[PDB]
């Protein structure tokens, strides 16, 4: 309810050569700040995996003769490809948030969004159902979790104030 | 992606027949390829060796661990290709190499445990991941339950891994009793030189190391590797080793230990000498893995060991996969199938392979001379970097032992090549069946990497100097 | 007259440029060996966001008088 | 500290010097885990710390799964052989 | 140097070797195949107790003696200790050339072990990493791992000795006409 | 019996020595047997809630240590999927 | 240079295709489109390595510039 932090955080830390926006961006922001390139990556994976299994069947077929894989496998393939692509897109947008890749558009968008939020007397980064202690635990669980995309998915859904920026 | 894969494959395999498991393996192989292609840009997070703590402080993510994870994905891709693509479309090769229904799921869960070992920062995560690896790899040894040898190996492996896990848990709980912590970040200069702590730490190191065959506890794992199927041996002889040695290299636990030095010398001598009278192929390769594990034990005494370990583990993985693939390819020309599970056992069954397939023997020669460490191949640069580190850090007797072991191991490495380039009566003149395209390409790619990877050493060092220093 | 060898001065200059490149690589290798094994920050080595090593423990029965510097 | 070390050491010796059974091997593994958990919980009480109890309940879960898997492997061995003998694992 | 107490260290040596031989005999008794009991630990052991005790006594006695005779602490003492230990291990085979070979070869091996520092470990303050390395700066005495562009000539003449080309003054300046 | 007794002595004494940080080896056992002096149990009034050990285990396991719970889930999945793979024979 | 690296990586790809065909006990020109596919694949790997290396050097030069 108070939305004030319990522990000290870095201020404007440098994960790369470009400036920082959010060190633990919300799922909503990471998906809304996506570029058309990210959706293109999503479609690319979605199309590449089923085409991949058909290409494999063309190279070395399971039985003796070539037969296009079942629509069963193509369906599961499309679903898994969309998942892989959403992962890559989320990672690209999150790295734009961290300052690892070029993030000028996202910087100006975040500036305007935060200015509008201040204009509307809203808290920056939102109001949470959780106590401050659970906000802290959630941030510590979710911060920099995209590094483990190869192993597990983890995303921020908690609206905590521990994004690594100045107080205002 | 792995957990998504596991939760997807469990359902999709439950709702599928046994006629579909090969295609399932193909699907998940392409999945892993797409992941390693599209998500590998995350290396930019670790610029200037930026390190991240995740899930509280239960996991650690750096360039070392990202690299080991990419390597484990590459290994899983190759091992899944060996199960998802038939070598020959004959009844024999549909009797020898068939995937079982749950095998891919267990492989992915074991990969999960491997990565949660290397990424571990707290001992609770380490223990959970060690058990998730070891239970899954028990079941992988046991899934071919129509083999007497494999069931026997399953049970031996269960009991010995159980005892060594008891040792790991005792070490962890003693560390906690002393320091009231499960985290090695809790250690510094002051705590090391103020508390005598080497018994606990070396107990942990040995409980982890005897799980990969460090002498004098090597015979049981060598029997397990002998007695298991070939396409299971290729996995269970490599991935646990990568996982545990990577954890022990990232965690600087044995920086100048006398016990680890002694046991590493013993591993070298045993792994070089004991492989000289071996007549079987898998035991020979097991002793090869043992002596390479010794070479990698040596760099647990350094405190700056990332480049040497990563180079050597990458080249050993490539060589291991290549040699097992060559032995898998040689089954078409051996004149006597021994078992449904180990179709080739003895080295003299490779006699005359140069007259049936000469370029397969060229591949074998390249891999054998990389194992020996002959330049310009990759094992030479591996051994060179290891020697550089250990001589920069003052291990002068171990270096001479290393040279002597490199020499003694060459004999049993050359046994294979020698019998392969011998003459044979009843050669092959024609065959209308052709081996797979994909597996041929994979083997050729590994051989070309072994042969021509030295061209990029400058570039690799320049990238290392930015991401690891 | 068929003998057209590169002159001594140009040979010396090319060799000197080669040796300068080699000494540059030497000094780079020394610099990199020194920048490694140099103490890094808590933010660079462990945690760039939560950069406070000081632990704040439980919260359910927090006693005034339990914190200490 | 004492009860746990004693149970652990005696279970380890009864595992190592077992020329009788496989069931004794299973039992000695389980009792070894028990001994570790007891040392762990005594230290948890003395330090007034939860990490020990967390590790202990995790060991309970993991040992249960270990028992399940081990006794499935034994059942496969028995599928093929039909008798689990004094020796030969 | 500081002298070694031969008989005390060798008595500790003998007791340690005896305990180790007992442990190895027990291990052999439990690992063996045939019917065995608590009687056979010393009846059917292949001279393990005598191996351990003889090797221990011989090595420590010879090491400390050579260190006290030579009045030094170096690897040659380990060469002698290995010679003695190999002589003990080779007297078991009741043959002369095997005895000689055992002596000579384990002498060479343990002497290499001593030459390299008498340690399977590292010193770790004499290693190249922890020691001053690279080019030495201003006329300072070159240490072991340091490098120098130009060395002193008095140092060369002392380390090497005069003769066979190497002289305290160059030849051309030494034969230059005083003009 | 010889190896049993040797190992009993060695393992027990090392297990009791391993818990203390003192440098001299004999003193490391002598501190382990130093269970002579009683602990004072004083009472504080700071704990206002009714939190017991199980409550705190749940709190830390579901907030501070959620990852190990969601990994134990996969361990239990193995506990289901392995035994079926090993004991059952799938028709086709 | 980029072009040299791409040519060499394509040569490695041709070598893989050749060695594959020979392990298969086929002629070396069995399916010549595989040479093109191997060339572009290995050239893509080489381009990736080239770009990674170039970004690394740019980083170590930006450090000098900021120094
Ligand atoms: C798909 C979600 C789409 C979406 O945007 O929904 C937003 C929605 C919130 O909608 P909102 O009203 O606008 O509130 C905005 C803030 O999020 C509200 O902020 P808040 O403070 O009020 O949040 C309160 C609470 C509100 O959350 C709830 O209580 C909703 C309950 C949803 C139940 C699930 C459905 O949020 C949480 O505390 C969620 C904790 C998330 C835990 C971490 C989960 C990430 C891992 C997922 C992958 C699985 C892990 C595998 C790892 C294995 C390890 C080896 O949040 C979720 O959907 C949570 C979904 C988590 C599923 C995973
Ligand atoms: C897992 C199965 C379950 C059963 C478990 C049984 C209980 C577990 C027992 C402990 C854990 C097992 C440890 C495994 C052995 C290897 C331990 C080790 O290597 O650590 C040694 C370490 C020093 O080595 P290091 O750090 O490498 O070198 C630098 C030296 N400054 O650290 C040390 O310096 C060690 C300190 C020396 C004291 C050792 C204590 C032995 C005392 C025995 C005396 C017995 C009395 C005399 C003989 C009686 C026989 C009748
Ligand atoms: C009781 C009173 C005590 C008094 C206090 C002082 C006592 C000191 C005790 C020291 C320890 C003694 C232990 C003796 C070794 C254990 C017994 C043994 O036999 O080991 C070998 C064992 C069985 O061998 P076995 O069944 O007899 O058959 C042999 C046929 N080849 O089979 C095995 O595999 C077990 C191997 C155990 C090895 C431990 C590690 C040794 C490290 C090797 C050092 C190598 C370094 C040298 C490097 C030089 C390089 C050229
Ligand atoms: C372009 C790469 C070369 C190539 O395409 O291979 C073609 C092959 C022979 O092709 P050809 O016989 O003329 O046509 C067959 C008709 N069906 O010719 C070959 O067999 C080429 C085999 C040699 C490749 C070695 C790698 C060269 C590396 C260059 C860098
Ligand atoms: C990575 C997949 C491994 C699978 C096995 C294939 C080997 C790939 C080697 C690329 C390593 C790299 O380019 O990286 C260099 C790494 C650290 O750099 P990095 O942080 O990982 O960034 C890499 C970013 N990638 C993933 C986008 C590329 O330094 C090392 O010590 C590498 C030591 C390995 C030596 C083996 C050389 C093999 C010859 C290569 C011929 C093309
Ligand atoms: C990603 C890999 C891209 C393709 C590649 O780089 O590899 C190209 C090779 C092509 O091999 P091929 O002999 O011409 O296939 C012959 C097939 N026929 C006979 C049906 C025409 O694909 C593979 O065999 C396996 C790639 C793994
Ligand atoms: C199988 C063929 C074997 C033949 C190959 C022989 C090569 C063996 C290496 C010989 C060189 C070893 O180099 C040796 O030199 C110096 C003296 O110069 C020794 O001198 C050093 O010994 C150690 C041990 O007391 C201490 O640091 C001591 O203060 C001294 O500085 C080192 O202990 C050893 O490193
Ligand atoms: C087969 C050839 C390859 C053999 C493999 C080993 C190669 C490396 C040789 C061993 C190096 C030994 O080097 C070690 O001993 C020398 C003495 O000689 C010591 O050098 C030190 O000696 C001390 C005297 O004790 C003096 O102060 C001297 O100024 C220096 O500081 C160092 O402690 C260490 O550098």
From TrEMBL, chain B:
Q: What is its EC number?
A: 7.1.1.2
| Reactions catalysed according to its record | a ubiquinone + NADH + 5 H(+)(in) = a ubiquinol + NAD(+) + 4 H(+)(out)
Q: Which UniProt keywords apply?
A: Membrane, Mitochondrion, Oxidoreductase, Transmembrane, Transmembrane helix
Q: Where does the protein end up?
A: Membrane
The record's section on InterPro entries has:
ND/Mrp_TM (IPR001750)
Enzyme class, top EC level, equals: translocase
Q: Where are the transmembrane segments?
A: 28-47, 59-83, 103-130, 156-178, 190-210, 230-249, 255-277, 284-303, 309-337, 358-382, 394-417, 438-461
NADH:quinone oxidoreductase/Mrp antiporter transmembrane domain location:
120-409
Extract the Pfam families matched here.
Proton_antipo_M
Q: Residue positions of the PTM N-formylmethionine?
A: 1
List cellular component terms (GO).
Answer: membrane
For membrane topology, the record states: Multi-pass membrane protein
A Gene Ontology molecular function term for this protein is: oxidoreductase activity
As for family, the record states: Belongs to the complex I subunit 2 family.
Name of the protein this chain belongs to: NADH-ubiquinone oxidoreductase chain 2
- Gene source species: Yarrowia lipolytica (Candida lipolytica)
TrEMBL record, chain C:
Taxonomically, the superkingdom here is Eukaryota
Q: Where are the annotated segments for Disordered? A: 46-69
Name recorded for this polypeptide: Uncharacterized protein
The source organism is Yarrowia lipolytica (Candida lipolytica)
Show which stretch of the intact protein is covered: 71 to 139 of 139
UniProtKB/TrEMBL annotation, chain D:
Compartments it resides in: Mitochondrion inner membrane; Mitochondrion membrane
Coiled coil located at which positions?
A: none
**Major location (coarse):** mitochondrion
- The EC number(s) this enzyme carries: 7.1.1.2
Give the domain of life.
Answer: Eukaryota
List residues traversing the bilayer: 21-41, 53-78
Alphabetic keyword roster: Electron transport, Membrane, Mitochondrion, Mitochondrion inner membrane, NAD, Oxidoreductase, Respiratory chain, Translocase, Transmembrane, Transmembrane helix, Transport, Ubiquinone
Q: Name one Pfam family in it.
A: Oxidored_q2
Instruction: Identify residues that carry N-formylmethionine.
Output: 1
- What are the GO MF terms of this UniProt record? NADH dehydrogenase (ubiquinone) activity; oxidoreductase activity, acting on NAD(P)H
Looking at the keywords, is Amino-acid biosynthesis present?
A: no
Which is a Gene Ontology cellular component entry for this protein?
NADH dehydrogenase complex
Spell out the reaction equation it catalyses. a ubiquinone + NADH + 5 H(+)(in) = a ubiquinol + NAD(+) + 4 H(+)(out)
Membrane topology type, per the record?
Multi-pass membrane protein
Q: Name one GO biological process term.
A: ATP synthesis coupled electron transport
Q: Which family does it belong to?
A: Belongs to the complex I subunit 4L family.
Q: What does this protein do?
A: Core subunit of the mitochondrial membrane respiratory chain NADH dehydrogenase (Complex I) that is believed to belong to the minimal assembly required for catalysis. Complex I functions in the transfer of electrons from NADH to the respiratory chain. The immediate electron acceptor for the enzyme is believed to be ubiquinone.
Q: Specify the protein name.
A: NADH-ubiquinone oxidoreductase chain 4L
Q: From which source organism is this entry?
A: Yarrowia lipolytica
Lineage of the organism: Eukaryota, Fungi, Dikarya, Ascomycota, Saccharomycotina
From TrEMBL, chain E:
Highest rank taxon of the organism: Eukaryota
Q: Which GO terms describe its biological process?
A: mitochondrial electron transport, NADH to ubiquinone
Topology in membrane:
Multi-pass membrane protein
Q: Provide the Gene Ontology terms for cellular component.
A: mitochondrial inner membrane; respiratory chain complex I
Report the principal subcellular site: mitochondrion
List the PANTHER family hit by this protein, alphabetically: NADH DEHYDROGENASE [UBIQUINONE] 1 ALPHA SUBCOMPLEX SUBUNIT 11, NADH-UBIQUINONE OXIDOREDUCTASE SUBUNIT
For this entry, the protein name equals: Uncharacterized protein
